[PDB]
Amino acid sequence: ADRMSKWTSKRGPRSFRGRKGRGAKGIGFLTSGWRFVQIKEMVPEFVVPDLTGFKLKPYVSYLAPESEETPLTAAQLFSEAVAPAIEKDGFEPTQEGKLFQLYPRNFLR
Amino acid sequence: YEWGVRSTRKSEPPPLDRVYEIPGLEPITFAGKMHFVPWLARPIFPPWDRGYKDPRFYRSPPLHEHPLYKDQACYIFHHRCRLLEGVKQALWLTKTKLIEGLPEKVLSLVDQDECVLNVISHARLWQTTEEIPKRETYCPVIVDNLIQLCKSQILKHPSLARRICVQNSTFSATWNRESLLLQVRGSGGARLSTKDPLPTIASREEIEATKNHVLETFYPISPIIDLHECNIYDVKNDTGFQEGYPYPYPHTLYLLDKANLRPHRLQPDQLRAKMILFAFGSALAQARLLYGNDAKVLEQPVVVQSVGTDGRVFHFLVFQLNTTDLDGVKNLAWVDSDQLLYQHFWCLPVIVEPVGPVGFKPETFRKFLALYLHGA
Amino acid sequence: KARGNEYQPSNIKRKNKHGWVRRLSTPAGVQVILRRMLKGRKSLSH
Amino acid sequence: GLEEFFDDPKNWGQEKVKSGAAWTCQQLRNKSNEDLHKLWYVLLKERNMLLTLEQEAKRQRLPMPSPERLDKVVDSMDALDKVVQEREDALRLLQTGQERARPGAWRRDIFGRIIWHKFKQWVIPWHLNKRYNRKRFFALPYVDHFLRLEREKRARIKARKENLERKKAKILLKKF
Amino acid sequence: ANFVSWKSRTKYTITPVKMRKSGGRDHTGRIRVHGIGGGHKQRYRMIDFLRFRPEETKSGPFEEKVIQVRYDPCRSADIALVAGGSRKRWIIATENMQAGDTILNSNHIGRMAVAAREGDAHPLGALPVGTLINNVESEPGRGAQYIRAAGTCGVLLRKVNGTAIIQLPSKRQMQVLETCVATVGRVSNVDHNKRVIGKAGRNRWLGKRPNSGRWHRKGGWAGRKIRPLPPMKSYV
Amino acid sequence: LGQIYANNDKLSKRLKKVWKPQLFEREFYSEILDKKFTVTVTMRTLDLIDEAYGLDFYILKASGEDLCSKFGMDLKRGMLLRLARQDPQLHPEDPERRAAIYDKYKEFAIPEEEAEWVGLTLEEAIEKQRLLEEKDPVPLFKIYVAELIQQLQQQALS
Amino acid sequence: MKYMVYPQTFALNADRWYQYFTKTVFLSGLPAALRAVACDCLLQEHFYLRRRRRVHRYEESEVISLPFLDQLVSTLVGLLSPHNPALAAAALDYRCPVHFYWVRGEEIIPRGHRRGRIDDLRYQIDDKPNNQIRISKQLAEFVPLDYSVPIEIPTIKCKPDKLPLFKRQYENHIFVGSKTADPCCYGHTQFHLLPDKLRRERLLRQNCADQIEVVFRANAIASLFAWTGAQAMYQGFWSEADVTRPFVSQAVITDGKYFSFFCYQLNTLALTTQADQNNPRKNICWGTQSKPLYETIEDNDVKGFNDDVLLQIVHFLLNRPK
Amino acid sequence: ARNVVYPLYRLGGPQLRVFRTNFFIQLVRPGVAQPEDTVQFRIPMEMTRVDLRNYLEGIYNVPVAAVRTRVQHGSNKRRDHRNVRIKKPDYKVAYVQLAHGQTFTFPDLFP
RNA sequence: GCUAAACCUAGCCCCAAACCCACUCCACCUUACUACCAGCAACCUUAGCCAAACCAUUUACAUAAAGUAUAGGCGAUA
RNA sequence: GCUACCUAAGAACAGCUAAGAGCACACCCGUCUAUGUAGCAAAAUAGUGGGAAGAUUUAUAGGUAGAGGCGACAAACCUA
RNA sequence: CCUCCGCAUAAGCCUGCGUCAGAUCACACUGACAAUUAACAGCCCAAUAUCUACAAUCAACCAACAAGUCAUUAUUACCCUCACUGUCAACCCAACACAGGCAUGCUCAUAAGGAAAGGUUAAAAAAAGUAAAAGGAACUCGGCAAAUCUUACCCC
Numbered sequence A: 001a002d003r004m005s006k007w008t009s010k011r012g013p014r015s016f017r018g019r020k021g022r023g024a025k026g027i028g029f030l031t032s033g034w035r036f037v038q039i040k041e042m043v044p045e046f047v048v049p050d051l052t053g054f055k056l057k058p059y060v061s062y063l064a065p066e067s068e069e070t071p072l073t074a075a076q077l078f079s080e081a082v083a084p085a086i087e088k089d090g091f092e093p094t095q096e097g098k099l100f101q102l103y104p105r106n107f108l109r
Numbered sequence B: 001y002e003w004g005v006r007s008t009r010k011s012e013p014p015p016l017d018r019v020y021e022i023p024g025l026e027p028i029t030f031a032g033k034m035h036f037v038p039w040l041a042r043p044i045f046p047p048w049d050r051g052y053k054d055p056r057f058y059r060s061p062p063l064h065e066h067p068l069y070k071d072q073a074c075y076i077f078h079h080r081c082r083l084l085e086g087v088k089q090a091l092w093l094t095k096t097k098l099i100e101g102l103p104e105k106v107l108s109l110v111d112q113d114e115c116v117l118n119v120i121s122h123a124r125l126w127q128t129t130e131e132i133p134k135r136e137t138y139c140p141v142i143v144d145n146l147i148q149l150c151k152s153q154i155l156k157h158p159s160l161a162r163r164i165c166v167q168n169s170t171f172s173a174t175w176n177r178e179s180l181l182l183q184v185r186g187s188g189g190a191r192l193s194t195k196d197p198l199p200t201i202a203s204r205e206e207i208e209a210t211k212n213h214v215l216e217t218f219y220p221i222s223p224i225i226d227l228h229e230c231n232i233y234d235v236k237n238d239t240g241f242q243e244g245y246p247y248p249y250p251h252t253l254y255l256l257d258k259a260n261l262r263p264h265r266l267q268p269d270q271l272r273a274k275m276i277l278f279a280f281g282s283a284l285a286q287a288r289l290l291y292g293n294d295a296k297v298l299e300q301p302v303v304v305q306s307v308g309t310d311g312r313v314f315h316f317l318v319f320q321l322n323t324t325d326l327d328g329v330k331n332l333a334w335v336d337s338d339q340l341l342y343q344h345f346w347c348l349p350v351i352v353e354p355v356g357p358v359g360f361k362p363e364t365f366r367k368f369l370a371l372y373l374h375g376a
Numbered sequence C: 001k002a003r004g005n006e007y008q009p010s011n012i013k014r015k016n017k018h019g020w021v022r023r024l025s026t027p028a029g030v031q032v033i034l035r036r037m038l039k040g041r042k043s044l045s046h
Numbered sequence D: 001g002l003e004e005f006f007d008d009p010k011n012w013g014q015e016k017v018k019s020g021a022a023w024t025c026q027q028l029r030n031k032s033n034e035d036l037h038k039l040w041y042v043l044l045k046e047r048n049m050l051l052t053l054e055q056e057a058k059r060q061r062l063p064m065p066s067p068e069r070l071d072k073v074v075d076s077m078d079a080l081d082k083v084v085q086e087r088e089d090a091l092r093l094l095q096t097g098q099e100r101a102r103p104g105a106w107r108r109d110i111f112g113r114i115i116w117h118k119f120k121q122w123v124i125p126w127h128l129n130k131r132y133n134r135k136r137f138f139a140l141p142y143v144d145h146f147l148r149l150e151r152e153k154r155a156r157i158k159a160r161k162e163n164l165e166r167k168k169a170k171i172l173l174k175k176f
Numbered sequence E: 001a002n003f004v005s006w007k008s009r010t011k012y013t014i015t016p017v018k019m020r021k022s023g024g025r026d027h028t029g030r031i032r033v034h035g036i037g038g039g040h041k042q043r044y045r046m047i048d049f050l051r052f053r054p055e056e057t058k059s060g061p062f063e064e065k066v067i068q069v070r071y072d073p074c075r076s077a078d079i080a081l082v083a084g085g086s087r088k089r090w091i092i093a094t095e096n097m098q099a100g101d102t103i104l105n106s107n108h109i110g111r112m113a114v115a116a117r118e119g120d121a122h123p124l125g126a127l128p129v130g131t132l133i134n135n136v137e138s139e140p141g142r143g144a145q146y147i148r149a150a151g152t153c154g155v156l157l158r159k160v161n162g163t164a165i166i167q168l169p170s171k172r173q174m175q176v177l178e179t180c181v182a183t184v185g186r187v188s189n190v191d192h193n194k195r196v197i198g199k200a201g202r203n204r205w206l207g208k209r210p211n212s213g214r215w216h217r218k219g220g221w222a223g224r225k226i227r228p229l230p231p232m233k234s235y236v
Numbered sequence F: 001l002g003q004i005y006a007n008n009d010k011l012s013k014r015l016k017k018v019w020k021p022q023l024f025e026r027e028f029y030s031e032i033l034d035k036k037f038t039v040t041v042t043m044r045t046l047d048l049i050d051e052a053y054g055l056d057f058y059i060l061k062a063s064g065e066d067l068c069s070k071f072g073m074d075l076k077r078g079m080l081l082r083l084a085r086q087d088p089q090l091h092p093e094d095p096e097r098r099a100a101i102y103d104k105y106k107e108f109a110i111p112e113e114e115a116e117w118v119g120l121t122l123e124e125a126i127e128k129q130r131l132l133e134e135k136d137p138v139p140l141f142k143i144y145v146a147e148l149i150q151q152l153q154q155q156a157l158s
Numbered sequence G: 001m002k003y004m005v006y007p008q009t010f011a012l013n014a015d016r017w018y019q020y021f022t023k024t025v026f027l028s029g030l031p032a033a034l035r036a037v038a039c040d041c042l043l044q045e046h047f048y049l050r051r052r053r054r055v056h057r058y059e060e061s062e063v064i065s066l067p068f069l070d071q072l073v074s075t076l077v078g079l080l081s082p083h084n085p086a087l088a089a090a091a092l093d094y095r096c097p098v099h100f101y102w103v104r105g106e107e108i109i110p111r112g113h114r115r116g117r118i119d120d121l122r123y124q125i126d127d128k129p130n131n132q133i134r135i136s137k138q139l140a141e142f143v144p145l146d147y148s149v150p151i152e153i154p155t156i157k158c159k160p161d162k163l164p165l166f167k168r169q170y171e172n173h174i175f176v177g178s179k180t181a182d183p184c185c186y187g188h189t190q191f192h193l194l195p196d197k198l199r200r201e202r203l204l205r206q207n208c209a210d211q212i213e214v215v216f217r218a219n220a221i222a223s224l225f226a227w228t229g230a231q232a233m234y235q236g237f238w239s240e241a242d243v244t245r246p247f248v249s250q251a252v253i254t255d256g257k258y259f260s261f262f263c264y265q266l267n268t269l270a271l272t273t274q275a276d277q278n279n280p281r282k283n284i285c286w287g288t289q290s291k292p293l294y295e296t297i298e299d300n301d302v303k304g305f306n307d308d309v310l311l312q313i314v315h316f317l318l319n320r321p322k
Numbered sequence H: 001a002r003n004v005v006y007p008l009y010r011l012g013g014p015q016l017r018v019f020r021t022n023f024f025i026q027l028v029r030p031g032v033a034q035p036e037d038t039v040q041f042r043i044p045m046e047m048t049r050v051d052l053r054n055y056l057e058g059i060y061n062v063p064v065a066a067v068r069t070r071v072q073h074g075s076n077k078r079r080d081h082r083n084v085r086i087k088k089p090d091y092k093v094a095y096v097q098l099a100h101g102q103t104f105t106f107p108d109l110f111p
Numbered sequence I: 001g002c003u004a005a006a007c008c009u010a011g012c013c014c015c016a017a018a019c020c021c022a023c024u025c026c027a028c029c030u031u032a033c034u035a036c037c038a039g040c041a042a043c044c045u046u047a048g049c050c051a052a053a054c055c056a057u058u059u060a061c062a063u064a065a066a067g068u069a070u071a072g073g074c075g076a077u078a
Numbered sequence J: 001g002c003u004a005c006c007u008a009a010g011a012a013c014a015g016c017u018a019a020g021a022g023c024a025c026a027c028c029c030g031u032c033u034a035u036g037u038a039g040c041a042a043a044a045u046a047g048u049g050g051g052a053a054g055a056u057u058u059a060u061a062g063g064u065a066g067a068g069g070c071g072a073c074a075a076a077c078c079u080a
Numbered sequence K: 001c002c003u004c005c006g007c008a009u010a011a012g013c014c015u016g017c018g019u020c021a022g023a024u025c026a027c028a029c030u031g032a033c034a035a036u037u038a039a040c041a042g043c044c045c046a047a048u049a050u051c052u053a054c055a056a057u058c059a060a061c062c063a064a065c066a067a068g069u070c071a072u073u074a075u076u077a078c079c080c081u082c083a084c085u086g087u088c089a090a091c092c093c094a095a096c097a098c099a100g101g102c103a104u105g106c107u108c109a110u111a112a113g114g115a116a117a118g119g120u121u122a123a124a125a126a127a128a129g130u131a132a133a134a135g136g137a138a139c140u141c142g143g144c145a146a147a148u149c150u151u152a153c154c155c156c
Ligand SMILES: [Mg+2]
Pocket: E211
């Protein structure tokens, strides 16, 4: 009668076992006579690029010199897209009619 | 007496907060937050409608606003409609004379039992692992076997290769009486379909002679009484096939009644009535297909048959549809009621009485065979 | 007869009897939970 | 193919493999978005390979050829994550002016302690969500006492810490 | 304390409805009535007690045909399945009520009285004085509450003004409006009174836990009381 | 809620007692709001109203700690607001009448920004405050742009 | 508890496994009115028969196809009773179950209190053929009892559980379409259709295009074996009293368009390791690649109809018991 | 991708993308003699069978024929000086059958 | 001569001062640690042991005035 | 989650004789004896026995809680 | 030589006699490594109206009483397929590797599953059996227990 062991899908009776799961993220819904309905849009499609002719490697040669850190804040970013502004003397008010919403995230990772 | 009980009804929403009566200040509610708090008033939300449409959480319009809702109620018949008055009511609905015997020609078309016995045994004992099979299993099976047996005289009669029994065929047929609108609907039963139409049983003198005899009144039961009263119906008749389908002419409606409980099953009179209705309906549809929907007395009256249900009992029916003009001459049906092959089957031996069908009679089988034959 | 085994386990019952949700459901239950928290217990509810 | 889940067949059974340094953040910052993405997949495969190797080692009762490399890779990955995330944050700030993308708010629960309730994401509005309205966000008077008690406990702990520190200092002084 | 009552079926129906037992319990969960529960399972045929009610869009008196006369598990009086027009319904049967038999259901308080057939239903205005009745309403269009058990019958004692006076089975008088509906004759299944139970098993089946063994010393109440029948009760 | 000695002698039982007041239901007109309210009022309340003459007057006159009801407080607040704004309460055809009514209660009638908060609980007040100073955050980009503009201006000047 | 063998399996290269279990040898190949009828049957279900309730893609094989198949069976049978008299007396059974239970090989118990004891590992097939044709006389032999055919049975290098094949303990059943008390104990043609899971489109979508033929083959190996086995059992024979005369049956698996044809030759019920050391006998399965009965249906007109398939079907139907 | 909020797919909405995948995987030697063409991986709990299939297909360009996952329990028994139970972590195992009869013997490392 | 003994620093107590804590990501009121769909809601004198040698009214919850005025089965005591 | 009573929806009762019937398994209870009494056991074992198609036995989930419940009253039972 | 047990499923427990390495009635004890793969089982079902009188008992005759366990229809809405979790063991509740308790399906002498005796001696006393001359209740509170079986009569 352990209180200390973490409650999981292995632990209960049949119904309990059926219900819980691990952190899987469901891929569809369930209907009629327990027929699962896998929706393609719910499934995450991995957007892998082509690595042919890609000169970067997973480690960096020791000979590369040291340099001090610079946390990329917003001000810096603005400065590095301020030339056009300067010339004048590129911004969204809302982003509700936009695919990749910056605030209440749509995009994954 | 109002049925319902107060404690099981949806509870009355609690008395609206007292700030809302005061004209006109802004009531501070918990709608500023996104959760209930007891302090702060109960907010009144606008009735939310989901913009886009998701099928799995769909809500239909009210019955008022439907694309074909009519004011005059149509009374509709299906496999599960199960009449209070049985056959007399059915006849009234159909407009028809009942005749207590099968016709002579069919009978003649009779003029082996071991096979039948074997079939029965198979149905009631052999066809599945578990001892004592259930009627939901065996009733259709028996019928199917009988049909097969009947077919197995194609060697004798080569015209029997011009037919086919078909399973998921529906129909619809609509008509008037006193006048109230009536409709019939398709089966959950087999349909023996032929290329050629059946020949007429009654002569045009016999048909004429129907005029004298009256339909049976049965007050005060209303004739519709047990049919689905329905607004929102659509008046289109329909044979269960598109145009240019070979084997279009309906021979026999092999409609059955499975169901392991006594209550779920039809009771024989009711079953008979249903059969009759089906016969009328298919026949009516055929007539409509042939001529116009403009009502009249027919030149070549169509004939449809129907065999009853149940592994044990059998209700045989032939239907002579001769008038699209209801509301003169009337139609006429020939029934051989509740004839029954085999009175009881024993699956296990009692203790004396062996494992098999007691009370067998082949007359029923013969009748069935005759019915099957009719056209050839 | 032998009376030692009063306990006779079934998880569903336990969860209904003694689960977090049940505790939450009353003020008393809530208080219990609070007390446990104060004490510093590793398993507040079952 | 599945050849990528292991390293070069030359290196199987050496006990020492050369693989210099992780990606420092500055370098990552200097690189493009697409480029960064590309690098990520390169990293990922390597990581997987390393993991596989580790597993193999565990199976065989033997030590890893060079477990620092795995660590380095991990570090690099972390750096990459940071850089991109930082950029995203900056973008958000520029556009909407929001620290954190996922929305929430300060909510007092049953137990009285104020929590950052992160918002969960739904199809229907909160007012007719059957489950959400059960999850109550308020205290009631029976909680105040408990809160007070908790506070007291916290204070006691703090006191203990402080006095202990002082004592230690005193001891040190005595010693020297 | 989970207790939703099974009485929750707004639509009238003939189909026998599923029925949860009580145990003599309340919604609290405590025993409010002793000697209840653990009987045989039952299903409820919803009885239409408002005898005169025309079907949708119909006005005056109508006829009915009896189809079946069944045993009801819920009560001592056996019941009858009735049909009229397009709708069927269960009603409480009278004595000698047969299958295939006709019943009248009148609203009409006639000039003269109406010679009643054992089954049929009329206002108390239409009935002769001294006719046996059952399923008596307390007001017009109220519904039948009184004289419903097996073999029961109250005589119509007299009519004065627009009111009739009834003798209930208990014998206490009851004054009602003249227009309130009743059915004539005595209620079906006479001889329910004389049905010997035979054993405690039967009782158990019926759904009655036994009496407690606690010995109670009898008190004041326990002697025979001879009283005059209490004053005639009016609903006017 | 109190206790009584049994026969009002101390040497008998002490036993607990709740004296309840006699509640009534009554309609009530108010000229300031123009509406008929049905209220759970007692006879003392009625007496008080009579003393003060108008119900409205009573509501206004009676202090918040003697009113002893949240509904009453709310009503008072509403009245105050009405007095302040000079809202169309009786609509067209009765402007003179409205004016007269207002003049009847020339006394009282606090500035509008005080009358909003009258008769609130603490929690309610807090909520109101939150609502007031809610606002979606200003994009940093805009701020940056402004700064840039300022800088440019400065440059131009020098 | 015994391995629960499913004929219409999703598992990959299951054929070999099935063969191993059964001890079969698979071999490629074999040992106008009608056409019109077939066409009509095809049309009826896809076009002419008016559906009240709408048909979805999950609902397609159940509602459209099975009934079509049934129609084909029955009508064809009717047609061929003149050409072949045995089908008149023959009992035709719709969706009537076929159970067969046998033992193949030893398994030392790996762990628990039963560890290190020889458990003879058991199997069972429980098929439901869409429909089948049973006769009282046994069919012809095809190939002689004891035929060498040196191509050899698959090896199988591990436990049968690794092919996703699970254990269960329930009623052990040796059942031909009907019980022993029944004259029609022998069989010949067996009609299967595959469910939604083993549609070829699905296979294509996955990377198992190789396994489009395989599934059918596996099914043939299984169900046919079970049927023959059942028949053998019904005539006394079993693992020790092994069959004296070769039991034979026929199959035609399908999925709507694509049919193929599978004869089966049962030479052994001796599958227990006791009775296999002195055993050169082995069962045989003949088989074609799945060929389309038609290209497509444009409204009410079969486009590219295939008569070869029809002919094959006829042949299957029309073989006699001597 | 593990430990991320997944956006809510309503009905007409877009495909869910994973740019920069969070979970990373390890292929292992089978313990109990598997068939040829089977490959045994250790999935991180949150990742699905479908996901695994997709993952293999994209990043490694492998023809995956079938996938079958399974949740292995990691032992809770085993204690400290304190008598507190150290829990070995529970992980997910994946049986991935290759296509085209590709075949894959797990190679010898540490020769 | 074995069992054993022995040992200072872990930390802690009382103060003084000063008003504390609480979002890496993910999950957590449904059976908490559970990605994703149409219903209710908090406030209501403490009591009793005990003392009165029982027990029944009653019985406490900066300094000084003062244990004073008072109260009290005019007693316990307050 | 024991037991007392109930509610929901379940399951079980071989064989022989002819109905809260008889004999008699499985199941339930626990008459009399012996053993056991820091025991195999904080009420057991061996036999012998009462019941075993019913007011029977019993698995699951829910309900009634102490100024209470529940009780075919034994002032029973309500986690030794 | 036993088998009054066995294999499953349910509930419960949660890696608890698998491999290697290691230590200390006799050697399931510590560390590392491995394992249970879905088709079985859980995890369901778009609205609004509208329908559901005739048990079960081989369901057939008989026969009842306690009166019962398995159903739609109409119209509108709707193409997307097989994700997720249980799957080990010599096992649960009784502080124990406790003669106790523990639901259902098969198996009713077993094709499962097991071992009453560490060795020796053969005293008393004690426990469980088997034995019996002659007698046969003379025993004792009582034929309790045992053995063979069955007569009559009270009380309640
Ligand atoms: Mg009594």
